[PDB]
Write a protein that binds this ligand. Structure first.
Ligand SMILES: [Zn+2]
Ligand SMILES: [Zn+2]
Ligand SMILES: [Zn+2]
Ligand SMILES: [Zn+2]
Lengths: 442, 442
């Protein structure tokens, strides 16, 4: 009954709070693998680590599924201001950037408040120059500031090249004022000349601004080494807690296994790997079996455009109708404060009620318009219900995509609360009688 | 009278709180010069900046005095763990390190809790190996943690070479857990083979520890580029507020103009330059003249061993008897909470009383055993009284000697409180009738 399962969920939360497992999994990943950019030598290391780890935890099935991934290698990154006042910058290439010319790159910059301002510039206005997008990212619990500025990183190099720019630097898409350059994916556009593209630290962007405010033009030097290889194979890594009376139905709880390459991928998304794996292990430890199968999916190549998520959706196309609900942890280790849903209108109040078991952990009732996390975000359009278990990310963009994304950034008590809430979610959902389909129109 | 001068001191503090001058001076230095390692091209840039700045503020005399300085240039710094689990490290050369061999340097490490533990190792025990000193620096308002661990940086390369080491890495002498490597001076010893010497970030030292805790040996790669040139000339930069009835007597308020090269030297010691310069300017702005001359000294090459301070003490030897008191701001921008003295026994209670004017700014009475700041610390032995105006440095070693020592680390309200307290100090001391000599035995 709902009552019996509420009490199991209460006990799962107790276990999460008394067990070092969640922390131990992320310590293991960050120490024994470290950064694991898709397509790098560390990609296979992370996959092999995850397979061994899941086997060692005793899951009923542990297997992997191939995902095609591109190969990009980061080389040197050096930048400085040449004039008016010569100074060093702390820079990093945007993910996928081409290298700077062998002859080298030195140019006058032109500052834009935002990507939109750059897109509005006159054609030819950046000939021989480097674009500088200065947009600052606001700090928000829900990360909505990142949502407003991230496109500068994703699309700035295209917009700048369209105006004649020979390069782009951006203010890091970060909420810190640390001397850390934030990387992340960017995309060139077929038809537009690819140009070198880098992020500079927030203090460096402040410095450039201080010089511009003196009615001086700023000239920089930028050097980026990088290399592109042909595509290869990574893997979605999967573990299951075997179901019982409804074993053909799947509750999917996910994270991504890949990361950027300059930190150790601790909060993005080693924390999420640990949260969903530990939650599933606590469930595996129960004397009771869930009705549904619980499937942990550790997705490949999320950083490169949800490639593993998209691959999974297609590979499991015939199985999606039997996916009861899907959710993903990929907003660091901050505690969960709300669960939002994407279920049938007639399921919404029932699932809110089911998850009131998490109220004492600080988790509020939510809406019925959830997108789901990145790797499951394509699944509602295919009919699959999802939940967004909302994490407090107020500090997340201080470290996201920097060399500072390290184990010591994880608050163990907060990590444990996520393990507790996912364990409750996966248990309650794997035993729920609520009909979650059909999803109402978006 | 003491009463009239108490009220001027109160008004000076008002000015400091209502004026952006202190902040503006450090903004100017960090933007228009940036990092200014002694002996680098930026050394002359900083001197020329300071001369122009002091002239622009209208000081009665502005001049400079030569200081011999060594020339060391930092090149590349790359390090990684090769085994058991290959990963990147964030490293920086210790100031003055020789370069690593052209053939390259890869070696097994041996961990030591502290410099003392390394010094206790058996001769030959580090043959072919790299020493790793792991001592963590405790956070303290007075910086006493730095005092306990700093010698690992200063003297570790010598102690490691004595035991056969081919190199040394240290846990950065820092209180942060940021991915920032802290540099700073080290000294080789004539007679002992010079070896490459670097600091790694605190998270990287944690990582190495996590591998060692797995009963694995750790092997690293270390690459350091550096170059030593012959000595050259830097300068102590001096400004004066002209005295009146006691113009032959000097109240010296100082800071150092030089910095390490990877940040912008904002808190070490751009803040101190701004504090003492702004304090003197507020005094210069008064309609009243001080009795004594107030001398702002912006010392050269403090980071390389107090070279400008030592030079000043010798150059001004015949003038020291007329130095009434000396003090230096070189503990960032945190507010002052206490003034300690080094005056005659019979002057102690009188100077405490004189400075009770700063109580409302949060400044407590202090002792009579002050060392004085670094550049004036040699002066008591020459008979010159000093004060230590104690700053709250709880956060100072998060940024000291890192690339993160940037303008945005300065709390403007705290910087203003220092300007207020130095203005009071310099005014009260430049008009005091207390006999400060002779100093009692140390
Ligand atoms: Zn992520
Ligand atoms: Zn990411
Ligand atoms: Zn200093
Ligand atoms: Zn220093």
């Amino acid at each position: 009954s709902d009552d019996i399962n509420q009490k199991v969920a209460e006990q799962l939360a107790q276990k999460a709070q008394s067990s070092s497992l969640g922390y131990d999994i992320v310590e293991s990943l960050t120490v024994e693998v470290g950064p694991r950019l898709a397509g790098s030598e560390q990609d296979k290391v992370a996959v092999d680590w995850a397979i061994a780890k899941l086997q060692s935890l005793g899951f009923d099935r542990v297997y992997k599924e191939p995902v095609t991934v591109p190969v990009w290698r980061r080389g040197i990154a050096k930048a400085s201001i040449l004039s008016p006042f010569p100074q060093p910058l702390v820079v990093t290439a945007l993910g996928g950037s081409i290298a700077t010319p062998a002859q080298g790159l030195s140019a006058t910059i032109v500052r834009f408040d935002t990507l939109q301002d750059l897109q509005n510039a006159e054609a030819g206005s950046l000939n021989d120059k480097i674009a500088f997008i200065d947009a600052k990212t606001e700090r928000h619990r829900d990360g909505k500031g990142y949502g407003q500025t991230a496109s500068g990183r994703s699309r700035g190099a295209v917009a700048a090249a369209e105006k004649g720019a020979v390069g782009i630097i951006i203010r890091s898409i970060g909420t810190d004022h640390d001397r850390m350059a934030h990387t992340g994916m960017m995309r060139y556009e077929e038809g537009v000349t690819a140009i070198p593209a880098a992020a500079i630290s927030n203090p460096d962007a402040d410095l450039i601004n201080a010089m511009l405010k003196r009615d001086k033009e700023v000239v920089i030097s930028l050097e980026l080494g990088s290399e592109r290889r042909g595509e290869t194979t990574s893997y979605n890594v999967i573990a299951e807690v075997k179901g019982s009376t409804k074993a053909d139905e799947i509750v999917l709880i996910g994270a991504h296994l890949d990361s950027w390459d300059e930190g150790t991928g601790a909060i993005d998304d080693g924390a999420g790997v640990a949260i969903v794996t530990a939650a599933a292990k606590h469930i595996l430890d129960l004397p009771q079996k869930p009705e549904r199968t619980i499937r942990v999916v550790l997705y490949a190549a999320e950083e490169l455009g949800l490639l593993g998520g998209k691959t999974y959706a297609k590979e499991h196309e015939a199985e999606l109708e039997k996916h009861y609900i899907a959710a993903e942890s990929d907003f660091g280790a901050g505690p969960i404060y709300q669960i939002d849903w994407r279920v049938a209108d007639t399921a919404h109040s029932p699932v809110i009620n089911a998850m009131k078991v998490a109220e004492p952990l600080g988790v509020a009732a939510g809406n019925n318009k959830a997108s789901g996390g990145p790797d499951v975000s394509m699944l509602p359009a295919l009919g699959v219900p999802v939940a967004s278990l909302r994490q407090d990310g107020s500090d997340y963009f201080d470290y996201h995509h920097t060399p500072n994304d390290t184990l010591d950034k994880i608050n163990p008590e907060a990590l444990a609360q996520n393990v507790a809430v996912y364990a409750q979610f996966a248990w309650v959902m794997a035993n729920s009688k609520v009909e979650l389909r059909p999803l109402p129109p978006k």
